[PDB]
């Protein structure tokens, strides 16, 4: 019944510093769980995990919040995406899970001859984007409101982005097979995924003093490893593969935390309207604070050489 | 330069050679390991992409001599492990690329009487070291084709293909696997084993002015040491089904055992080679080369308890 610690964090009786201390322990426990004494064992563990994903299913916000939130490190990364995806003016572009449309809007403005199509889960996000289009006068963008795991079209695209989407997937084979059908002749697919450098795992509690896992990930999601997509090349082939150290996401979470805290009184306002309650507002806020605190700590581990980012460029076949 | 001459006349002990290799090894590790995963990975992918621009690629009495575990037993254990991981079954057509001594080709053909086994060698000799074995063992399910795998063309497809100790001699893995993929039958499999370093890959180019090992052992052919995961980046024409590694202790042990049999029988071997090469010292020079090869590589694969250089095995299906 570990479930008491939370409202303590939640009335603020547990400091950010204590939460980092707690995550340090969680990190050491996860690393010890995953690492193996020999390469033979370490690799077997990864191939066995990849095979298990093939037995799974592909997969399982107020607008004043998006306005407050949503910094040129974001710009750097998005230029890096365009360069590694070899974007050229004139191409048709598909953005899978475009979210806040940060990438969709950036490409549309940089490459005015491109046609950029975004696919999103949410009304609020489609709204934020297509009304970002009106202020930059972008005629460049179409947003389709739909489930990516359910979407399909006769249309093919020169370039497909899949950033922050793998994190919600389990059966990578079914995902890449479906996406492969949308790739035009000589088209390319760019994927970015948070990972551990060496091993993969499902978010399951490590022992009965592990609160992080069920708190942050209440059913079954997967942390990928940096090389795991190399074992899913039945329908696409790898063109290139890069990683970036955990310091980059670490900083991202800390900056996001800062923007939230710097604006906390108006965020606290927005979520009371949206949720109709101060208690529920308070618990959205606490969840996302702990998320940033805990993941900032996680990605910083060992100078960013444990958890990190993986980017993979695919072509069809 | 003159270091080489001296080794050949036996004024450079085995222990000195092991020591020289320990030094070489520490230099190669320092050269290969990078401070960050970003750089480490970049080094590997850039190396694999460079392979895509490259080309693809003994007296019988010696073979009769050389052919805690004994050498014999570990060899049998390894060939049973190949048959298990390659999912061999009685009745399959089986292609052995670079069948060499013909050990695996004969092992398979003997165990699965219903299999047809075809081997490929580019040798005057090895072909009937195998074909002599067949007439002896009274096997009729073996055919050996005299040919360079590099230029070999066929329209036949096979349920199972073996490529063991072959990749070590190749550079452009992309070209190799494309040609081979066309020989895989419907629902067939390709089993590859290669020596490698666990993390990084390299061409055998001298690390510095004191690097005698690289030129002495790999004069040219601009040969390549693979990494354990490098074939993952060569999946345009084949798809990985499984992937295993075995620690360096296994090949290290093998190199030690081979040297022991060579040394246990040096009288006969010198006889054989100096007859065969029509020159005594030219025979001391081939013998020295293979002794140094075994001593150096036994030491290399032993490094850090077998966790640096090792064996990688990859099972592929057709795309």
DSSP track, A242-276: EEE-THHHHHHHHHHHHHHHTTHHHHHHHHHHHHS
Partner residue facing B41 (CB), from A231, A237, A242: A242
Residue B215: its H or E element? helix B213-217
CB burial of residue B176 (10 Å; 0-12, 13-18, 19+)? buried
CB contact under 8 A, B235 and A233: yes
Q: Which residues pair with B146 in a beta bridge?
A: B121
What Cα–Cα distance (Å) separates residue A221 from each residue in A203, A218, A224, B294?
A: 6, 9, 10, 49
* Contact A138/B at CB under 8 A: no
Distance of CA A312 to the CA centre of its chain: 14
Q: Is A311 in contact with A190 (CB distance < 8 Å)?
A: yes
CA-wise closest residue to B90 among B71, B109, B67: B109
Both tokens assigned to B300: 């290399």
Q: Is B130 in contact with B142 (CB distance < 8 Å)?
A: yes
Residue A196: its H or E element? strand A183-196
CB contact under 8 A, A226 and B37: yes
Measured in angstroms, the resolution is 2.0
Q: Strands, DSSP E only, in B168-219? A: 184-197, 202-203
What Cα–Cα distance (Å) separates residue A275 from each residue in A16, A68, A70, A270, A291?
A: 25, 18, 21, 9, 20
Q: What is the dihedral of CA B43, A228, B252, B100, to 10 degrees?
A: -90
Q: Rounded to an integer, what distance in angstroms lies between the CA atom of residue B284 and that of residue B273? A: 8
* Residues of chain B contacting A47 with CB distance shorter than 8 Å: 242-244
DSSP code of B10?
A: T
* Residues of chain B contacting A40 with CB distance shorter than 8 Å: 244-247
Please name the method used to determine this structure. Answer: X-ray
**Residue that has been written with the tokens 């709204």 in this structure:** A127
* Contact A264/B at CB under 8 A: no
CB contact under 8 A, A243 and B307: no
What are the backbone dihedrals phi and psi of residue A193, each rounded to the nearest 5 degrees, phi first? -140, 135
CB burial of residue B145 (10 Å; 0-12, 13-18, 19+)? middle
Q: Rounded to an integer, what distance in angstroms lies between the CA atom of residue A241 and that of residue A227? A: 9
Question: What 3-state class would DSSP assign to B71?
Answer: helix
Count each helix (H run) and each strand (E run) in chain A, helices first.
12, 9
Q: Rounded to an integer, what distance in angstroms lies between the CA atom of residue B112 and that of residue B116? A: 9
Q: Which residues pair with A173 in a beta bridge?
A: none
Q: Rounded to an integer, what distance in angstroms lies between the CA atom of residue B92 and that of residue B83? A: 12
Distance from CA of A317 to the nearest CA of B (A): 7
Domain hosting B60: range is: 1-319
CB contact under 8 A, A39 and B232: no
* Contact B233/A at CB under 8 A: yes
* Conformational region of residue A152, where left means phi above 0, alpha means psi within -120 to 50, and beta covers everything else: beta
Breaks (C-N over 2.5 A) in chain A follow: 60, 70, 218
Interface test with A, best of B38, B304, B310 (most A CBs within 10 A): B38
Domain count, chain A: 1
Both tokens assigned to A126: 């489609």
Task: Please report the sign of the dihedral spanned by the C-alpha atoms of residue A255, residue A256, residue A259, residue A260.
Answer: negative
Q: Rounded to an integer, what distance in angstroms lies between the CA atom of residue A78 and that of residue A197? A: 22
CA-wise closest residue to B244 among A102, A118, A42, A285: A42
Q: Rounded to an integer, what distance in angstroms lies between the CA atom of residue A246 and that of residue B213? A: 39
B44-71 b/e (C-beta count within 10 Å ≥ 16 → b): bbebbeebeebebbbeeebbeeeeeeeb
* Residues of chain B contacting A241 with CB distance shorter than 8 Å: 41, 45, 233
* Contact A4/B at CB under 8 A: no
Residue B45: its H or E element? helix B37-51
Interface test with B, best of A176, A233, A234 (most B CBs within 10 A): A233
CB contact under 8 A, B229 and A233: no
Residue B246: its H or E element? strand B238-246
The residues, ordered by sequence, that sit 6+ positions from A135 with a Cβ below 8 Å of its Cβ are none
Distance from CA of A283 to the nearest CA of B (A): 37
Q: Rounded to an integer, what distance in angstroms lies between the CA atom of residue A43 and that of residue B314? A: 12
Both tokens assigned to A75: 């710009």
CB contact under 8 A, B240 and A226: no
One-character DSSP codes across B92-112: -EEEEET-TTSHHHHHHHHH-
Give the A window 40-59 contacts with B, CB below 8 Å: 40, 43-44, 47
* Contact B66/A at CB under 8 A: no
C-alpha atoms less than 13 angstroms from C-alpha of B152 in its C-beta half-sphere: 24
Residues of A labelled catalytic:
292
Q: Rounded to an integer, what distance in angstroms lies between the CA atom of residue A36 and that of residue A45? A: 9
Q: Rounded to an integer, what distance in angstroms lies between the CA atom of residue B233 and that of residue A174? A: 20
Q: Rounded to an integer, what distance in angstroms lies between the CA atom of residue B101 and that of residue B111? A: 17
C-alpha atoms less than 13 angstroms from C-alpha of A134 in its C-beta half-sphere: 6
Partner residue facing A242 (CB), from B42, B229, B319: B42
Q: Which residues pair with B317 in a beta bridge?
A: B189, B239
CA angle in degrees (0–180, nearest 5) for B20-B23-B24: 85
C-alpha atoms less than 13 angstroms from C-alpha of A120 in its C-beta half-sphere: 21
CA-wise closest residue to A225 among A193, A243, A198: A198
Question: What 3-state class would DSSP assign to A92?
Answer: strand
CB contact under 8 A, B38 and A240: no
Closest residue of B to A234, CA-based? B239
């Amino acid at each position: 019944a570990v479930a008491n610690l939370i409202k303590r964090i939640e009335h603020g009786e547990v400091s950010d510093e204590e939460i980092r201390g707690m995550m340090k322990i969680q990190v050491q426990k996860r690393l010890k769980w995953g690492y193996k004494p020999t390469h033979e064992q370490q690799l077997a563990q990864l191939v066995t995990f990849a095979q298990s994903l093939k037995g799974m299913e592909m997969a399982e916000i107020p607008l004043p919040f998006l306005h407050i939130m949503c910094d040129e490190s974001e710009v750097y990364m998005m230029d890096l995406y365009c360069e590694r995806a070899q974007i050229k003016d004139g191409q048709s572009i598909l953005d899978l899970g475009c979210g806040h449309g940060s990438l969709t809007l950036h490409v549309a403005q940089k490459y005015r001859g491109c046609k950029v199509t975004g696919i999103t889960n949410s009304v609020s996000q489609k709204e934020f984007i297509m009304d970002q289009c009106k202020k930059l006068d972008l005629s460049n963008v179409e947003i389709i409101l739909e489930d990516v795991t359910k979407f399909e079209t006769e249309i093919t695209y020169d370039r497909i982005f899949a950033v922050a989407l793998i994190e919600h997937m389990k059966n990578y084979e079914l995902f890449l097979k479906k996406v492969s059908t949308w790739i035009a002749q000589d088209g390319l697919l760019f994927v970015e995924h948070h990972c551990h450098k060496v091993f993969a795992y499902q978010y399951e509690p490590l022992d009965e003093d592990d609160w992080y896992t069920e708190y942050i990930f209440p059913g079954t999601l997967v942390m990928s490893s940096s090389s795991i997509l190399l074992y899913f090349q039945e329908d696409v082939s790898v063109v290139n593969h890069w990683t970036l150290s955990g310091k980059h996401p670490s900083l991202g979470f800390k900056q996001w935390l800062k923007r939230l805290d710097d604006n906390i009184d108006e965020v606290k306002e927005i979520f009371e309207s949206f949720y109709g309650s101060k208690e529920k507002a308070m618990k959205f806020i606490t969840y996302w604070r702990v998320f940033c605190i805990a993941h900032s700590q996680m990605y910083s581990t060992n100078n960013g050489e444990e958890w990190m980012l993986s980017q993979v460029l695919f072509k069809k076949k």
